[PDB]
């Protein structure tokens, strides 16, 4: 009934989170001229579940300037909430069709900087506050941005429900409706989602792992796999907002198959972007949201908000 | 002294003092130390290993180059013995399990291996022979730490006509499971201990002195046969453990005079985990027995090894349980225990 | 054309290691299936390509 | 049988820790730049487990690449401490090694071994890029012939 | 001769600003450094698959002392001890002693693999081409007892290894 | 027999290029933008 389609969600999302490592480590040393890991397991698809099993058996490091209470209900916060994101994704028909998704999964994003906020302050270090101070600025930095973009997209959708998504983008990618405002999405997913050029905190030497500075296995696999959950998701936020594809009520198959092509591509190239830029300065992060990203950001909306109203192509809520 | 076996040096490193300690069970406490000490002023201390290598690799850095020379052994084997102490010519026993393993019955943890390997090394050629026993060694006492510890003794006295058997009080360092244990019940609970601690009298010592004590013994040649006691600088009833060492980690001081009868359940409850048996039985009845006087045997003081107080040096051990707030107290900010001794 | 070129190589590959079991061994033992030439065998068993 | 199932677990963490090292930089010389081709693609280590995650905390053997100094000497201990078990070190090249070229001076501690227990030695000044490979597969094997769960079921 | 480098100069004209303003708006420079990294990712690697493949050396190659022996079969190292006196980092131990034939032999040769450089000078110092640096560098250890190496290891080295040696110093004692 | 280490041919080699020789690549200007413009029409519409 109800609860064998909740394994049959999370459990697949979390086994496809542990494999995530392996092309991170492969497709960058393609790109980089290495190989990536092959010699564990047939063309590396063991190395994930070697990388998985140390961390569950390593010992886990409980500093003594850490909060114990602290130290363990930030992984679980934000785990869990990488995986009741995926609870309104319209998959065909989605798990949970909530009528506010739109809201409900920006709603739940904010609360994402709990887990680092909580993190930082429990592990109680001068270089790690820091590090987590100006890490969850840029995040909140970036929401807001986040924000005006979702208003302005589903302004031409609709209502937030998700699955109105898959009905307003029938004929044409709304990509092609709001490309200007597609690559204003797609760097923002880059920001909050933690990746270069805002890898940040779990960037291997530009806080050498932030979020994880003193957090080793263990309990680390909660807070370095979350991340990476993000990123499958948000980038499948995407897929679903710009790059929707057909659904036959008689054949959902056709769905899945174009929706995880598209989403997985899309990964590609969030894998592909941390191979081919720099880091961004604290001080470039805000001047490029708040100076450039920002207003032109708000001028979309202003244009967004007009246009319907411009060729009386308001769109049906209901 | 043999062609090779004179001594050389100025006691570092790469200086042979002409001692070659066998010591048995390094792998742990007070074998980490003793080798420490072996190894300062340079010795080939052949240590017996047993479990695996990956924890006996961290006493490799205290011995020069090609002096911890691991040796696999097994109890059981009698001929395993026999390789280990052939060439040793003073040879440091540290056998024993504080703890009970099925496969180890606590009589063999202080009768069997310890006769096992007094017996050979007599058989071999050495010279000495240290077996560690217990300052409160008895065998009619309900303890089986101290029933299998007195038999025991007398056999490797008996075996060994030159056997100078030590006999240490409850020795505290950085992983005594002493001091670090009696920080534990505010993690385990309320301090189930009987009759609040006004029941026992202890001399703990800092094992340092103790380690010190064998390697003294060492060069000392009048040791042989006599039994030595090392005994710490002062006793100490029960209860002011309790409360000195819930001060020198500032622990919230819950102390409860939970009476034997409930205390001897909870500790098969902690052997009940088949990984390691945190409190057994006979820990139940080991800290509620009190330390004998025991004045007739001479001590460490005697032998030049003077006593360290127990207060001087207890957060060297328990800094870690002090919790972030209060990590960086000393002894200064906390008051000595009542010095219930001589 | 060259797309079933190359497919047809890798299928040769796969035949000349030994068909099933020599290109399972070679894959699972050296992480590799490159079929070459042999230059021979020492004393061992050790075969070099 | 139990020590059939003492094997196959033995068996699974021996594998999964052997095959996915991360190891920690410590190179402090030119024995750091030879490691450093491993990184290169001529001798990709990545392709077997030994990844960038880095992050001292999140490592499991540490590479001591270079000569070693006094007033280096307590620093890079308290990392050896500070990195959780199973920790080992790899000594790379003559000088972490036993001094090497600088073994008569006041201001190098001659080898890694008076500081931490070396488990693997990687002769070479510099040693080859490959030779460290060679010396990671070996490291690599050892952890394959541990009984940590073997020795526990005689206990 | 000299050459400047950022001396290059914007130009204002409606063209050339469309140019940058387009550059900036509609990250171009951004693309192109993707589209380098894609097309290496379909550039074949080039990882080197040890242990099976390993990597290429030179017949001059220096590693792993081993004392060789005449074609007669007696070792070559008369004692000169020239070696002992080059050795830049003292790694060479040797005690001589007049065999019971008569010659030299050296009773104790001795060098310290980790205070060794393997700097090739040893080689050039006999005359007798008696110490050479062998081709290996498999021979990593887990104790650092083994790499202290002595006469019988560096005669073991010898023998084991002579016939790749032998070609070895064949043809490069032309360049010597 | 004569000397016979490693010497260049007579030609020397082949003249090896140094210069910075990036490609460029790209659209006009205008085009792009104009490109830009013309999808967003046709997507409104
Ligand atoms: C009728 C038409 C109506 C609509 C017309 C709208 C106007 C015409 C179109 C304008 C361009 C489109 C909107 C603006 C886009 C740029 C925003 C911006 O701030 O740019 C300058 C900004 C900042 O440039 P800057 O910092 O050098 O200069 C800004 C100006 N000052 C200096 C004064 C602050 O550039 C960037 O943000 C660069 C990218 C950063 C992130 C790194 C990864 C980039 C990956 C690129 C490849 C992948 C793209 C994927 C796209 C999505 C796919 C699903
Ligand atoms: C099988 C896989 C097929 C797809 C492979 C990847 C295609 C995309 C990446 C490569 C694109 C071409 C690379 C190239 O020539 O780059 C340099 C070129 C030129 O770069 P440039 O910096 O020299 O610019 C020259 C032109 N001026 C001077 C006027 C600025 O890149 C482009 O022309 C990019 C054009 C499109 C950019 C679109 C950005 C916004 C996208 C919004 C969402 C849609
Ligand atoms: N306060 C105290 O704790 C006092 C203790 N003692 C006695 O001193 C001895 C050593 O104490 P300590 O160093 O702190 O103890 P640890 O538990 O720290 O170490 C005990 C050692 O004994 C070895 N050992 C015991 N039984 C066997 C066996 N059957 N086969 C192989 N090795 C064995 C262990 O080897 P492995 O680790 O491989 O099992 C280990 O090296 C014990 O007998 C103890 O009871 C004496 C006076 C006071
Ligand atoms: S061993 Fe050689 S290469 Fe390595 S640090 Fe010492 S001198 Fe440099
Ligand atoms: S290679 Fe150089 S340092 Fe090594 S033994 Fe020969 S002369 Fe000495
Ligand atoms: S230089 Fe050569 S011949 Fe002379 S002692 Fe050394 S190895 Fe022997």
């Given at each position: 009934m109800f609860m064998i389609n909740i394994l049959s969600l999370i459990i697949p999302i979390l086994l496809a989170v542990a494999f995530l490592t392996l092309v991170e480590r492969k497709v960058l040393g393609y790109m980089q001229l290495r190989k990536g890991?092959?010699?564990?397991?047939?063309?590396?698809?063991l190395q994930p579940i070697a990388d998985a099993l140390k961390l569950v058996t390593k010992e886990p490091l409980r500093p003594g300037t850490s909060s114990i209470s602290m130290f363990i209900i930030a992984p679980i916060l934000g785990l869990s909430l990488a995986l009741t994101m995926w609870?309104?994704?319209?998959?065909?028909?989605?798990?949970?069709?909530?009528?506010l998704g739109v809201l409900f999964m920006l709603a739940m994003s904010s609360l994402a900087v709990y887990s680092i906020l909580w993190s930082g302050w429990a592990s109680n270090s001068k270089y790690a506050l820091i590090g987590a101070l100006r890490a969850v600025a840029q995040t909140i930095s970036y929401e807001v941005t986040l924000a005006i973009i979702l208003l302005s997209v589903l302004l031409m959708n609709?209502?937030?429900?998700?699955?109105?998504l898959i009905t307003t983008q029938?004929?044409?990618?709304?990509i092609f409706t709001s490309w200007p405002l597609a690559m204003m999405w797609f760097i923002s997913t880059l920001a909050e989602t933690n990746?270069?050029?805002?890898?940040?905190?779990?960037?291997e030497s530009e806080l050498?792992?932030?979020?994880?500075?003193?957090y080793a296995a263990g309990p680390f696999a909660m807070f370095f796999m979350a991340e990476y959950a993000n990123i499958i998701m948000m980038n499948a936020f995407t897929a679903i907002l710009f790059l929707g594809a057909s659904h036959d009520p008689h054949t959902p198959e056709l769905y899945t198959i174009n929706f995880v092509l598209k989403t997985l591509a899309l990964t590609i190239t969030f894998l592909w972007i941390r191979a081919s830029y720099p880091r961004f300065r604290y001080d470039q992060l805000m001047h490029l949201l708040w100076k450039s990203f920002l207003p032109l950001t708000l001028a979309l909306c202003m244009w967004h908000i007009s246009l319907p109203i411009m060729t009386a192509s308001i769109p049906p809520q209901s | 002294l043999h062609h090779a076996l004179i001594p050389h040096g100025?006691?570092?490193?790469?200086?042979?003092?002409?001692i070659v300690a066998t010591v048995?069970?390094?792998?742990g406490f007070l074998g980490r130390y003793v080798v420490n000490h072996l190894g300062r002023m340079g010795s080939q201390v052949i240590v017996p290993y047993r479990c695996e290598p990956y924890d006996t690799?961290?006493?490799?850095?205290?011995?020069?180059?090609?002096?911890?020379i691991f040796m696999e052994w097994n109890?059981?084997?009698?001929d395993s013995i026999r390789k280990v102490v052939e060439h040793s010519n003073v040879v440091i026993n540290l056998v024993g399990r504080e703890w009970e393993t099925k496969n180890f019955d606590f009589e063999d943890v202080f009768v069997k291996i310890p006769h096992a390997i007094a017996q050979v090394s007599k058989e071999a050629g050495v010279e000495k022979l240290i077996h560690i026993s217990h300052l409160?060694?008895?065998?009619?006492?309900?303890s089986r730490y101290l029933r299998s510890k007195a038999v025991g003794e007398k056999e490797v006295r008996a075996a060994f006509p030159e056997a100078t058997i030590i006999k240490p009080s409850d020795i505290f360092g950085?992983?005594?499971?002493?001091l670090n244990y009696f920080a534990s019940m505010r993690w385990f609970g309320?301090?189930?201990?009987?009759?609040?601690?006004?029941?026992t009298v202890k001399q703990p010592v800092y094992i340092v002195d103790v380690s010190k004590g064998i390697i003294n013994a060492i060069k000392?040649?009048?040791?042989?046969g006599k039994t030595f006691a090392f005994v710490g600088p002062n006793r100490y009833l029960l209860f002011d453990l309790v409360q000195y060492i819930f001060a020198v980690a500032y622990r919230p001081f819950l102390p409860y005079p939970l009476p034997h009868f409930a205390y001897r359940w909870v500790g098969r409850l902690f052997e009940?985990?088949?990984?390691?048996?945190?409190?057994?039985r006979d820990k139940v009845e080991r800290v509620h027995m009190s330390d004998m006087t025991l004045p007739h045997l001479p001590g460490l003081e005697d032998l030049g090894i003077q006593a360290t107080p127990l207060e001087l040096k207890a957060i060297e051990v328990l800094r870690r349980h002090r919790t972030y707030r209060w990590?960086?107290?000393?002894?200064?900010?906390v008051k000595p225990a009542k010095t219930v001794n001589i | 054309m060259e797309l079933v070129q190359v497919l047809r190589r890798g299928l040769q590959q796969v035949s000349g290691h030994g068909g099933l079991r020599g290109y399972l061994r070679v894959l699972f033992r050296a992480n590799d299936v490159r079929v070459g030439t042999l230059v021979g065998e020492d004393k061992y068993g050790n075969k070099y390509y | 049988r139990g020590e059939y199932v003492v094997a196959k677990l033995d068996d699974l963490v021996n594998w999964a820790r052997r095959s996915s090292l991360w190891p920690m930089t410590f190179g402090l010389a030119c024995c750091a730049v030879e490691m450093m081709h491993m990184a290169?693609?001529?001798?990709?280590?990545?392709?077997?487990?030994?990844?960038?995650?880095?992050?001292p905390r999140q490592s499991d053997v540490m590479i001591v690449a270079g000569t070693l100094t006094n007033k280096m000497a307590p620093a890079l201990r308290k990392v050896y401490d500070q990195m959780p078990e199973p920790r080992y070190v790899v000594s790379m090249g003559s000088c972490a090694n036993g001094?090497?070229?600088?073994?008569?001076?006041?201001?190098?501690?001659?080898?890694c071994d008076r500081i931490v227990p070396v488990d693997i030695y990687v002769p070479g000044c510099p040693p080859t890029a490959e030779a460290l490979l060679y010396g990671i597969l070996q490291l690599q094997r050892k952890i394959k012939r541990e009984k940590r769960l073997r020795i526990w079921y005689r206990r | 001769t000299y050459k400047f480098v950022n001396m290059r100069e914007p130009s204002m004209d409606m063209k050339s600003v469309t140019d940058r303003a387009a550059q900036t708006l509609l990250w171009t420079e951004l693309v192109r450094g993707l589209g380098m990294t894609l097309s290496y990712l379909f550039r074949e690697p080039a990882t080197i698959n040890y242990p099976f493949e390993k990597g290429p050396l030179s017949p001059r190659f220096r590693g792993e002392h081993a004392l060789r022996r005449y074609p007669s079969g007696?070792?070559?190292?008369?004692?000169?001890k020239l070696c002992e006196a080059v050795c830049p980092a003292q790694a060479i131990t040797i005690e001589a002693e007049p065999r019971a034939d008569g010659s030299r032999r050296t009773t104790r040769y001795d060098i310290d693999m980790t205070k060794?450089?393997?700097?090739?000078?040893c080689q050039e110092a006999c005359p007798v081409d008696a110490i050479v640096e062998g081709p290996?560098?498999?021979?990593?250890?887990?104790?650092?007892?083994?790499?202290?190496?002595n006469k019988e290891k560096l005669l073991n080295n010898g023998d084991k290894w002579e016939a790749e040696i032998a070609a070895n110093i064949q043809a490069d004692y032309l360049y010597r | 027999s004569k000397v016979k280490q490693d010497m260049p041919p007579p030609g020397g080699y082949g003249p090896i290029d140094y210069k910075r020789n990036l490609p460029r690549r790209g659209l006009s200007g205008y085009s792009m933008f104009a490109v830009g413009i013309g999808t967003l029409l046709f997507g409104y519409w």
């Open positions: 890991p092959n010699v564990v397991g047939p063309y590396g698809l609870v309104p994704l319209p998959m065909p028909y989605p798990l949970i069709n909530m009528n609709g209502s937030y429900t998700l699955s109105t029938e004929h044409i990618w709304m990746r270069a050029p805002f890898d940040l905190t779990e960037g050498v792992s932030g979020f994880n500075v003193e | 100025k006691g570092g490193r790469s200086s042979v003092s002409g048995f069970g390094a792998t690799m961290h006493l490799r850095p205290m011995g020069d180059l090609g002096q911890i109890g059981k084997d009698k409160n060694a008895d065998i009619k006492s309900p950085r992983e005594d499971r002493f309320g301090v189930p201990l009987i009759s609040l601690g006004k029941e000392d040649p009048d040791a042989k009940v985990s088949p990984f390691e048996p945190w409190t057994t990590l960086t107290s000393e002894m200064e900010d | - | 290169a693609p001529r001798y990709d280590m990545d392709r077997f487990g030994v990844v960038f995650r880095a992050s001094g090497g070229y600088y073994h008569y001076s006041y201001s190098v501690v001659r080898g | 007696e070792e070559r190292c008369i004692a000169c060794c450089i393997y700097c090739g000078f290996n560098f498999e021979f990593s250890t887990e104790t650092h007892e083994e790499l202290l190496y | -």
